[PDB]
Amino acid sequence: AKFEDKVDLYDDRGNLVEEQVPLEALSPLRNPAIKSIVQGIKRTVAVNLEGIENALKTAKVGGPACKIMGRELDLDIVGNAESIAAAAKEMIQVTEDDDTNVELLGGGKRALVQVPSARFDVAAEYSAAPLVTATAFVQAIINEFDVSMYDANMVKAAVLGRYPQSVEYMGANIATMLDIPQKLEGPGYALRNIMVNHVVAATLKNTLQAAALSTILEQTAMFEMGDAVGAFERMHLLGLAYQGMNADNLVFDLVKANGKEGTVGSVIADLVERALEDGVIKVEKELTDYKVYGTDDLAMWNAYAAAGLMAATMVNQGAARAAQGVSSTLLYYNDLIEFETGLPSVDFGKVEGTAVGFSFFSHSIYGGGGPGIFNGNHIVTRHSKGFAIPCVAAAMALDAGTQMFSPEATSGLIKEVFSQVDEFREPLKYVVEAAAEIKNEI
Amino acid sequence: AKFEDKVDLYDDRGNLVEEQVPLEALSPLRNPAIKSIVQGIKRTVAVNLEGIENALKTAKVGGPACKIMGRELDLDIVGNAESIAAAAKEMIQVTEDDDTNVELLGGGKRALVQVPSARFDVAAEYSAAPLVTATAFVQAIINEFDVSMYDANMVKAAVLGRYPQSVEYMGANIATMLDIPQKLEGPGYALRNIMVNHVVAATLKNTLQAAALSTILEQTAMFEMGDAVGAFERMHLLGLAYQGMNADNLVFDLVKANGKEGTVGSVIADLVERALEDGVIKVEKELTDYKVYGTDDLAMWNAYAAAGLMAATMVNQGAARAAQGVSSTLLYYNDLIEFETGLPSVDFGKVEGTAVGFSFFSHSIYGGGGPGIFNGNHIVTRHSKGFAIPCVAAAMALDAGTQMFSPEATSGLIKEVFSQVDEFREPLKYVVEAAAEIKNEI
Amino acid sequence: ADKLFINALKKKFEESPEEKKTTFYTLGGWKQSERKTEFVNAGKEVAAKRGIPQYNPDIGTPLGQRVLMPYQVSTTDTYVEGDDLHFVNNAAMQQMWDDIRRTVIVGLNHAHAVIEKRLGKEVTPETITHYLETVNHAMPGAAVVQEHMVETHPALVADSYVKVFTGNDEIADEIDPAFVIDINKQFPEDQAETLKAEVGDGIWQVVRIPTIVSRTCDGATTSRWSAMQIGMSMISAYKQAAGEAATGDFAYAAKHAEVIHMGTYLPVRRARGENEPGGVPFGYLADICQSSRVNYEDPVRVSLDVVATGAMLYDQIWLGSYMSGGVGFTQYATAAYTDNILDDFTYFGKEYVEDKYGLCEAPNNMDTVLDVATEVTFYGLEQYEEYPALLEDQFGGSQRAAVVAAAAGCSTAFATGNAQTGLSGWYLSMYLHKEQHSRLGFYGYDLQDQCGASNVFSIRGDEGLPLELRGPNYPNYAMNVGHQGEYAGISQAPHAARGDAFVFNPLVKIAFADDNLVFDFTNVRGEFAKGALREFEPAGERALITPA
Amino acid sequence: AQYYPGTTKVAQNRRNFCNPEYELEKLREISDEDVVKILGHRAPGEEYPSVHPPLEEMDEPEDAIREMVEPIDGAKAGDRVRYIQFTDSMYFAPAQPYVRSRAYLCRYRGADAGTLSGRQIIETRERDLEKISKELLETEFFDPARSGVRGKSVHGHSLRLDEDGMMFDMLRRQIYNKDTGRVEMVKNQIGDELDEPVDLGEPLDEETLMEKTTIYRVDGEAYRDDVEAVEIMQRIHVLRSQGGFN
Ligand code: F43
Ligand code: F43
Ligand SMILES: C[C@@H](OP(=O)(O)O)[C@H](NC(=O)CCCCCCS)C(=O)O
Ligand SMILES: C[C@@H](OP(=O)(O)O)[C@H](NC(=O)CCCCCCS)C(=O)O
Ligand SMILES: O=S(=O)(O)CCS
Numbered sequence A, B: 001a002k003f004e005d006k007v008d009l010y011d012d013r014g015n016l017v018e019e020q021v022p023l024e025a026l027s028p029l030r031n032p033a034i035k036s037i038v039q040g041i042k043r044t045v046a047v048n049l050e051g052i053e054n055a056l057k058t059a060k061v062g063g064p065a066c067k068i069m070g071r072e073l074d075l076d077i078v079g080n081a082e083s084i085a086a087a088a089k090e091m092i093q094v095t096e097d098d099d100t101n102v103e104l105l106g107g108g109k110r111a112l113v114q115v116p117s118a119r120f121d122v123a124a125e126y127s128a129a130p131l132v133t134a135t136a137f138v139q140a141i142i143n144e145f146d147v148s149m150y151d152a153n154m155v156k157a158a159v160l161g162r163y164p165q166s167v168e169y170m171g172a173n174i175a176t177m178l179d180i181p182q183k184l185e186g187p188g189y190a191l192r193n194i195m196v197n198h199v200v201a202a203t204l205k206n207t208l209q210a211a212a213l214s215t216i217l218e219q220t221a222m223f224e225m226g227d228a229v230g231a232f233e234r235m236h237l238l239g240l241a242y243q244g245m246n247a248d249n250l251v252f253d254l255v256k257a258n259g260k261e262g263t264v265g266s267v268i269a270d271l272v273e274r275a276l277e278d279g280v281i282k283v284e285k286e287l288t289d290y291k292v293y294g295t296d297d298l299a300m301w302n303a304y305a306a307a308g309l310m311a312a313t314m315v316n317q318g319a320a321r322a323a324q325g326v327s328s329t330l331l332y333y334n335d336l337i338e339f340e341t342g343l344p345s346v347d348f349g350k351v352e353g354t355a356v357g358f359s360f361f362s363h364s365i366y367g368g369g370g371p372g373i374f375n376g377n378h379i380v381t382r383h384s385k386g387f388a389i390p391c392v393a394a395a396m397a398l399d400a401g402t403q404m405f406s407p408e409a410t411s412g413l414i415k416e417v418f419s420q421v422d423e424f425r426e427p428l429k430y431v432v433e434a435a436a437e438i439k440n441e442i
Numbered sequence C: 001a002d003k004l005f006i007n008a009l010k011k012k013f014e015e016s017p018e019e020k021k022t023t024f025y026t027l028g029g030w031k032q033s034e035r036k037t038e039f040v041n042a043g044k045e046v047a048a049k050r051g052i053p054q055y056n057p058d059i060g061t062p063l064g065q066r067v068l069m070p071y072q073v074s075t076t077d078t079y080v081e082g083d084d085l086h087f088v089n090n091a092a093m094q095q096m097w098d099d100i101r102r103t104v105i106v107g108l109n110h111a112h113a114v115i116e117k118r119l120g121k122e123v124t125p126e127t128i129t130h131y132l133e134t135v136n137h138a139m140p141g142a143a144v145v146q147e148h149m150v151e152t153h154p155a156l157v158a159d160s161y162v163k164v165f166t167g168n169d170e171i172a173d174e175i176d177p178a179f180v181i182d183i184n185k186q187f188p189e190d191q192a193e194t195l196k197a198e199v200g201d202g203i204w205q206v207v208r209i210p211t212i213v214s215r216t217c218d219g220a221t222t223s224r225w226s227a228m229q230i231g232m233s234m235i236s237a238y239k240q241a242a243g244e245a246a247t248g249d250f251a252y253a254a255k256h257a258e259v260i261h262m263g264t265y266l267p268v269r270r271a272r273g274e275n276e277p278g279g280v281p282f283g284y285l286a287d288i289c290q291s292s293r294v295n296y297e298d299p300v301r302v303s304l305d306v307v308a309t310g311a312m313l314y315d316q317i318w319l320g321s322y323m324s325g326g327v328g329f330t331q332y333a334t335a336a337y338t339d340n341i342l343d344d345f346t347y348f349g350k351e352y353v354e355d356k357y358g359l360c361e362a363p364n365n366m367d368t369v370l371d372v373a374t375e376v377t378f379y380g381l382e383q384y385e386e387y388p389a390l391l392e393d394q395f396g397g398s399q400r401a402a403v404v405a406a407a408a409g410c411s412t413a414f415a416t417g418n419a420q421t422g423l424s425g426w427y428l429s430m431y432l433h434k435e436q437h438s439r440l441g442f443y444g445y446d447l448q449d450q451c452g453a454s455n456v457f458s459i460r461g462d463e464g465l466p467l468e469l470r471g472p473n474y475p476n477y478a479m480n481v482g483h484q485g486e487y488a489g490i491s492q493a494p495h496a497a498r499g500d501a502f503v504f505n506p507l508v509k510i511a512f513a514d515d516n517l518v519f520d521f522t523n524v525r526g527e528f529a530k531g532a533l534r535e536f537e538p539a540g541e542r543a544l545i546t547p548a
Numbered sequence D: 001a002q003y004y005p006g007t008t009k010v011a012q013n014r015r016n017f018c019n020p021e022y023e024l025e026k027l028r029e030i031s032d033e034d035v036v037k038i039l040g041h042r043a044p045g046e047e048y049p050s051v052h053p054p055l056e057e058m059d060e061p062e063d064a065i066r067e068m069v070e071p072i073d074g075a076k077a078g079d080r081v082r083y084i085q086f087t088d089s090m091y092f093a094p095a096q097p098y099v100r101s102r103a104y105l106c107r108y109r110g111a112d113a114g115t116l117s118g119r120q121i122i123e124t125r126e127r128d129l130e131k132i133s134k135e136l137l138e139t140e141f142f143d144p145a146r147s148g149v150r151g152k153s154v155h156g157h158s159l160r161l162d163e164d165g166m167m168f169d170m171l172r173r174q175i176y177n178k179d180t181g182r183v184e185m186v187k188n189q190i191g192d193e194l195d196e197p198v199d200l201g202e203p204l205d206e207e208t209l210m211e212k213t214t215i216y217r218v219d220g221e222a223y224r225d226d227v228e229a230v231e232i233m234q235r236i237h238v239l240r241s242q243g244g245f246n
């Protein structure tokens, strides 16, 4: 191991799973469950067979309100889903019995597709998943019904939309958690361009699992971006462990202690007490009736403060059962804790700054929207290096129905397919098990 | 197994290496050497230490003609290259015995860097190569000289340029054969956005190796794009084999027979005779003193015609030792062969169309440039699905010095570093060897 | 009786149109031309005033060794030198693009759901009318909430406003009619019924931002500017806190969830935001043109009005300026909207199809493509061979290729009722023309042409698309003149023959059925002629704020 | 090789231009010096400029393709790549734009040919270009009234002929002399005045233009009546269409 730290790992009920696991057993670079999650997100596609069929029978293809009169084709795709899926699978696979999965859902209305991992090992990026899936289903539909040369272009339009006249798959009837590479705000950002509502949908609104999936994706992006290289690597790993994996049960125990009557402020007080008790901070000097705290381990202070930040979101937005105030929690947990202690807030001010913009762009005319439509690639919420978005995921998992652009509204296709995948749905379970398995190899 | 075709494989001297190799042993999806080449191109970075040092000493950072007076820093980077490179390597690697390579070249003026393959297995794309390399060298330079907090931002600007104000690494002193994901013309295009001159530089102007490397990259992209899925897969594989791998020594033998006195037309006549002799085409109909040819195997006709196309480029541009007429060869080989035979030209007209635009955009005021600045992602030359750009690489390999924007002008940093890598420099050798190895697993 | 281009040829040249010989070099070069003479004098004055040489007729080669021709704007009696059809010199052309660029369509369906379900307030025609009065004050750049706001001059932004439409007649009739695009008034009965069925109970805004702003800024400004003032007007009209959490749902709805841009953004080599010409698909361009609702008894007229719209926008402004510039591409485009030439060839093809098949009665297959496109190609090419004046008029091969293939492709689609076989006929026309004359267009003209046949019916990722969904960003089409506007005409052709109210987006069709626009989209060629004559009045000028 | 389908004189003339075993009819004699003057790239007695050093002076590594392909003489020397460009009247000039590019890549080595409606160009190494150009100028590729050597300002392929039967030229590079009935080249291909004009001989008469032309027209042989040539074009269209689909 590069680092000396060990953490105790817990399950989503707050019960111990494994003591004293080296920190790097949770690293995206080392943990095999994080690898399988990331590769799974690259290769998984939701296919809306019913959507394709409806688009074809109405000639409504190529984006919102679009329609080509005279081009309608009435094809019994959902009734023939088994044959179509099998034919697509034959084209999608590399070899028989490899890791290709094609599984019908909703009585043939949807398909889960996982394109074989070997296609990605000889690809630059991740677009093979929608592109290989789309063309396999286009060809399978044409071959199922013997669609003529003259008409087959409508099948293509119904599947993939207005691409390539549009840059995106505009009007497509397939969906992925990832978005196209051209939409990245910077190189390395692809695992950040995953809508918060998609994470919350895939984890069935389990608060800890949504926080874990979001943290995994954000902190894995931080490796791809180079932010977690060299001097910063331990900071990022400790953030992942304490804010997103409930290391040492710290998030869980802060929520337990503050959930009945607590506020953001009472969580802060408990976190500062716990950091002092653990030797993470110490009084550096006394001003007039005011203690100035210092630390000999800024990355560990940052991680403890990040656990408190997550717990403060769960307490504040959990009490309201309304996600909107996550932007306020992200701001004032940080602002208050700095004047409480004399130490820098989470991500050295970057969570607080993200929260200022996020609050503005979720309560103003100028852009943004509700919490669930943000993501680590959004211009409003890209600035903190993994320490903000997972709190938004936790807040949206706790929302009891206050949002118009809810996961039910934005992410239903993603929910139906991606929640099937155990490792997407319960990543805290699988990443902890994998870390315990490799604990003596790190 | 999926296809019954077999091919004989040769070296770049026209000697037989392995007979009766199953076609799929050359597939990007199966051949381990193509996998190694593609992962190698994702992970390899050229670092210009001398360039970083000079940018710092003059404060000339952030793009052409840019300079910040008063910000000059004089650091002995090249003189301390061994230490800097070692410190960078420690940050770049995942573990101490992995496949990370950091090798100094040019007395420490340059470094070859290959970022460990494992970072890519938990990444969405390929930008971890430049981003991890850049930060590791920025940090290693700062740490070598104890550069202050006040000055270190100049080191960052010297290494990676104006990013993130610019979307590209504008003014960077690192280079890769790939370009940023935002510049893709479509999803799946990243292995196409590799300048022809970079391929020619990496292969040291060996014509057959340049054509092979270009074909491997282009046809591998066709898999990532979905173009080589289902109906089209055999067409793409046979194109790779016959146009880029010299299958059955067809390209080689056509050049041998036409090299002394031949023209594009004489190569066409020989290819049509060979296709007839091999049973690929046959006379379908007699018009008035004119035989109309047919085929029962369009993918195979396409592949023979593609081998002829490559040979015609080698004969025509090889005789001129001037690459510009490749655009004309690509056009009139295909136009002439259709009227010679009554069969469709290579890629069913898409080479000829690519050639029309490429001719215009290499002989007009409106855009483009010389052959070496094109690539499969360029708007002018994206249209053929792998059958045009490898000929451009062959032509530029054969150019004796007629180009202003030559590989010496555009690709010197790439040449110094990427030609060190045996599988990049001599891919034909490695891909044929791997195909022969796996021949019984297909 | 006479071919439709004969009058124009007799105007241009002293010789009869069939005459093979002429005499050159006798006209005094530029001195023959009123317009060139105006330019010589203007260049002298410009150069003298600014102290830098400028237009000079003796730089380079001497224009006008042959006749510098007038052009008849097709369907009009207006004859002008081609310089009057350059977009820079033609305010109607500039305003046509401004009117598209500065328009977005923005639903009120999510917005009304947010009001009802989240604010807990009722929406009715009365509340919608109050909202519309408010947004018509705010949209041009005026305040509704804060103190000490400074605002745009109303007269500089007189062209900016918001209207709505809905397919529910009784709802439409209850909103104040000053704000309503009345589908029943603007469209003939059967088209109106089709459009109202598409829209249903949906309620959509058509927002036009100020021309002066669009000119200062870009097309990607339009949906933002629209959303800001929709947002302020939702605050004011429905009594929100002025910036609460629900405010962000209106922003997301107006900017993303229920916006329809005229054009989608472009990839980096040709980087542009939304609402630029390259993002406008061919089926939207056909829908923007309003010929369909006024000339519906004549499908040739409808189709060729769309060709004019698109040849000008796509070749002159887009390819000839955004994507290149300079002297540019005026006559590459004018060939498709002058001298009644394309009209002659396309009426021939329409009548041929009527006689052999009946409109929309031909099988939708390659047999029909081969028959119609070949016959019409040969007619068009014979006209250039029979009339040397015609060939000297459309002197560039690209111009002839585009005109002949547009007639062939439109005619094929008149026969099949399907744009895709129309497109196949366009490509077959090019192949035949190339073999007939041993030439086609400019150096790069047939890139898309040679890819063309194989890509018509492809289904692959970046190849397969119905023609209506293609546009200037379809890969093969991204570079070259003499195709894009003609493709918009082919996209329109089968729909005009079928009597369809729209080609690809019914909301776009309705959104331009509006006499409050500055350009008259019902009569594109008439407007081009009015601009050529210097008789068009554009929006966006700065005269009110600059010295008298 | 069969080159081109069809049963017209046009189709046979297209095949003859492509077939390197067909002896192009020589119609006129032009001196070497005069070819050089018409090209306009170098002055009489001027050494060939170079773009790179002679091949022999280079340290090229082993390359089997290079080794098998013999360089043209100008490539061996390092000559600049230069051009010659022609415009062909649609009123029955003998050669036409695609005819030229197709023929050039059958007949000539190391050739960059470009086709346009109003101009057709070949670019190759300078000394080789001079040898090719003599053949383009002396033979039935060229008629001095209905074809023009023009490096710029090419307008005229689609224009009416003048009263002498000459194609339009904005720069008047070729002048018909009533007194001889011959044409003289008075400017080089880019339009600069020649010290002394070059005799290009007599324009072909109408009968001979019709025997030699490669354009199809309603008033000559119509393409639509060369049904076998149309059949092959249609066949190509259909086979490309089917192939792009499946
Ligand atoms: C509706 C919002 C929420 C939102 O998303 N934007 C608003 C409104 C918007 C509108 C107001 C126009 C109108 O009245 O119709 C515009 C002009 C943007 C636009 N749509 O054109 C604007 N703000 Ni505001 N906005 C401003 C400002 C401000 C200051 C005003 C504080 C005060 O005491 O007056 C406060 C924020 C703060 O408290 O710091 C403010 C709030 C707000 N800002 C509150 C309304 C406040 C209220 O109810 O009065 N803006 C300013 O601080 C100065 C510049 C000023 C901008 C106009 C200009 O620059 O000339 C204007 C910028
Ligand atoms: C220098 C080029 C090469 C290039 O990249 N672009 C040119 C020139 C360019 C310039 C010419 C302006 C000027 O004279 O200064 C402009 C106007 C673009 C610009 N920079 O504004 C243009 N072409 Ni061109 N270009 C045209 C055309 C053509 C036709 C003209 C053939 C003929 O017989 O006259 C031929 C191609 C062909 O043979 O098919 C052509 C060639 C050429 N095109 C040759 C010059 C030909 C010559 O030497 O005379 N264009 C056309 O065919 C018609 C439309 C026309 C364009 C202007 C307009 O649309 O109004 C113009 C479009
Ligand atoms: C955030 C983002 O909006 P979206 O969330 O993408 O709708 C962005 N607007 C802005 O940044 C508004 C900037 C100017 C208005 C506020 C100035 S404080 C944009 O339109 O691209
Ligand atoms: C090719 C490309 O130019 P570059 O090679 O990127 O310089 C492109 N221009 C064009 O497509 C020119 C189109 C308009 C002029 C030619 C019309 S036929 C562009 O500027 O993005
Ligand atoms: O001569 S070119 O075809 O290159 C340009 C025509 S505008």
Ligand SMILES: [K+]
Pocket (backbone or CB within 6 Å): C214, C215, C216, C217, C218
């Ligand atoms: K503008």
Ligand SMILES: [Mg+2]
Pocket (backbone or CB within 6 Å): A249
């Ligand atoms: Mg406990």
Ligand SMILES: [Mg+2]
Pocket (backbone or CB within 6 Å): A266, A269, A270
């Ligand atoms: Mg407490």
Ligand SMILES: [Mg+2]
Pocket (backbone or CB within 6 Å): B146, B147, B148, B149
């Ligand atoms: Mg220091």
Ligand SMILES: [Mg+2]
Pocket (backbone or CB within 6 Å): B286, B289
């Ligand atoms: Mg015989």
Ligand SMILES: [Mg+2]
Pocket (backbone or CB within 6 Å): C053
């Ligand atoms: Mg002067």
Ligand SMILES: [Mg+2]
Pocket (backbone or CB within 6 Å): C515, C520
């Ligand atoms: Mg009006």
Ligand SMILES: [Mg+2]
Pocket (backbone or CB within 6 Å): D029, D030, D031, D032
């Ligand atoms: Mg002699």
